[PDB]
Amino acid sequence: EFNVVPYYSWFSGITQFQKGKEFEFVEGQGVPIAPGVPATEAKGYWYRHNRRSFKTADGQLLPRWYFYYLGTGPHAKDQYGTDIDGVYWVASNQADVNTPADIVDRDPSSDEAIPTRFPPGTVLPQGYYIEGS
Numbered sequence: 001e002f003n004v005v006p007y008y009s010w011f012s013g014i015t016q017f018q019k020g021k022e023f024e025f026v027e028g029q030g031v032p033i034a035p036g037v038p039a040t041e042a043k044g045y046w047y048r049h050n051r052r053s054f055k056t057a058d059g060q061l062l063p064r065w066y067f068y069y070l071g072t073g074p075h076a077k078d079q080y081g082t083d084i085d086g087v088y089w090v091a092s093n094q095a096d097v098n099t100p101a102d103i104v105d106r107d108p109s110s111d112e113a114i115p116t117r118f119p120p121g122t123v124l125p126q127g128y129y130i131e132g133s
């Protein structure tokens, strides 16, 4: 969870379950599907939420990534493709990444997160679980 209110993503998260696996997509892939969104607007980044667990006396809570359209979210001002720790840029080959996507953020009690799904052919990152699936 968050102790500081996050920017809300339009989509469900993708959660790491195998340690040592890299979060990645093939260039041109990795933008989740949202009805009626034109491919020219399918551009943005996945953002890593590092999660932390509390200490017990038993015996670890791997990261979860969330998608933000280009020009929105916690890295709204950063340039597409720029190395940034915790940021993984993705865009349809139809998209011009010099321009912010035309999509206002999600207002979380006028609209719920869309379950994250990729088009046929999308190479899925092994070691990661798409929430909702």
Ligand SMILES: O=c1ccn([C@@H]2O[C@H](COP(=O)(O)O)[C@@H](O)[C@H]2O)c(=O)[nH]1
Pocket (backbone or CB within 6 Å): 006, 007, 008, 009, 010, 011, 012, 013, 014, 049, 064, 066, 112, 113, 131, 132
């Ligand atoms: O940093 C964020 C941004 C949004 N999500 C929202 O959480 C819900 C699902 O999270 P998940 O467990 O499927 O990752 C969706 O509404 C998603 O947009 C968060 O709660 N944390």
